[PDB]
Amino acid sequence: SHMNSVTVSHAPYTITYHNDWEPVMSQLVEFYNEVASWLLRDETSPIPDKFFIQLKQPLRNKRVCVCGIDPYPKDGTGVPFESPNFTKKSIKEIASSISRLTGVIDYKGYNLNIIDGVIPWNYYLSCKLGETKSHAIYWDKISKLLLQHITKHVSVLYCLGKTDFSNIRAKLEVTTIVGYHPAARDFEKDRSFEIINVLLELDNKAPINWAQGFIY
Amino acid sequence: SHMNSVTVSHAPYTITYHNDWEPVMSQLVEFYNEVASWLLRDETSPIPDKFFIQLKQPLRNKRVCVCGIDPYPKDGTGVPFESPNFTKKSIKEIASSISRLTGVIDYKGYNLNIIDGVIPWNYYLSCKLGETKSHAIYWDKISKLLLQHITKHVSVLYCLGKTDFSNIRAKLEVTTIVGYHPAARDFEKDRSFEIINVLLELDNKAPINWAQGFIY
Ligand SMILES: [Cl-]
Ligand SMILES: [Cl-]
């Protein structure tokens, strides 16, 4: 069924997750306990209470995963790409791409987490405040475990960042696009890489309406 | 440089390979020796002398990998998908897709191994005469090793067969399309999946001219 379950750890001490994540929660508890103490030492983005909040998303209704390597170095919320005040460069560049693709001119913000069929994801679920990929060693196996579970549900995996994702062993056993980082210099590639996965969808599944992410 | 090197085994006893495959040849010798005796027991497709002939292809000039799970159950040549007399269903269906995409009406045959930028590949390099995926257990680690090496060179990995490739742990560390099997029942998906990877190319690399495969 569709429900939220619960599991015990140490800081945030309790992880609430949607039913769909069950197959993975036993190993995630094992992995997090042997790692948390090394991890919690630093000021993190997001705060420990927000590490796993994205596990409250169902995967049954997801067909696309938009994956960044890790949360914003500062002001991370626990929801990947989310910037509640729309000041973070990465989500502003995605918004502009979508704006250009769809034809939507006016908007106050953009959020990938409110689009039907889309789960936004952070490969590593944290980093030390102000330092990208700084907690990579701690999430290692957890990261592989959770992306393995996601790619069983979603049809398209869209990774943002070529060098960010350059050395990452991961899943075995679907359609992957390794596009540029949203804040890359030189546009056509960014914008076409988001239009290209609705036609990868067409081969079987329903399209994504990327404009559902716009906040007015 | 660009040259063909040589390595020692036991049946076919000698493996000739292009320079580009060097990083992988030490492990492939280790892996093949501990496996060959179990493998050579059966009548195979292709014959042992043809197992590794596709290692004579450079990878430096390859941007697309078209991957089947293993050679034809009968009449395999050592070159993936190749049917010298154009009677095998899989290559005839690919040819028809290309014919429909390109506009080429008349041809005697089709070969993926004569297209610039394309390396055709068999995940498992053999099978028992008349039985698909029958030598899967023997190639296991070798298969992972060689596809790992290919995907470092190519920009697009195109796998043909959803259930054929359903349970396959593989590479870590690029753009993957898991399309249908060429001999699938119900066409648009087959043909669009081959037109879709030239635009995945466009994001960075030169296009593939699929019509280069036609034999007149
Ligand atoms: Cl984030
Ligand atoms: Cl073959």
Numbering used by the authors:
A (entry chain A), B (entry chain A): -1 to 171, 174 to 186, 189 to 218
Paper text:
The structure was refined to an R value of 24.1% (Rfree of 29.9%) at 2.4 Å resolution. The asymmetric unit in trigonal space group P3221 contains a dimer (type I) with subunits A and B related by non-crystallographic symmetry two-fold symmetry (rms deviation of 0.06 Å for all Cα atoms between individual subunits). The packing of vvUDG in the unit cell of the trigonal form gives rise to a second type of dimer (type II) formed by subunits that are related by crystallographic 2-fold symmetry. In the vvUDG trigonal crystal form, one glycerol molecule is located in the active site of subunit B and occupies the same position as seen in E. coli UDG. In subunit A an imidazole molecule occupies the active site making interactions with D68 and displaying hydrophobic contacts with F79. The chloride ion (Cl-) in subunit A shows distances of 3.3–3.5 Å to backbone nitrogen atoms of active site residues Y70 and F79 and the ND2 atom of N120. Protein regions at the type I dimer interface only observed in the trigonal crystal form may be involved in the binding of A20.
Vaccinia virus, which is the prototype of poxviruses, encodes a UDG (vvUDG) that is significantly different from the UDGs of other organisms in primary, secondary and tertiary structure and characteristic motifs. It adopted a novel catalysis-independent role in DNA replication that involves interaction with a viral protein, A20, to form the processivity factor. UDG:A20 association is essential for assembling of the processive DNA polymerase complex. The overall structure of the vvUDG protein in both crystal forms is similar. vvUDG adopts an α/β fold described as DNA glycosylase fold in the SCOP database that is composed of a parallel β-sheet of 4 strands (order 2134) with 3 layers of α/β/α.
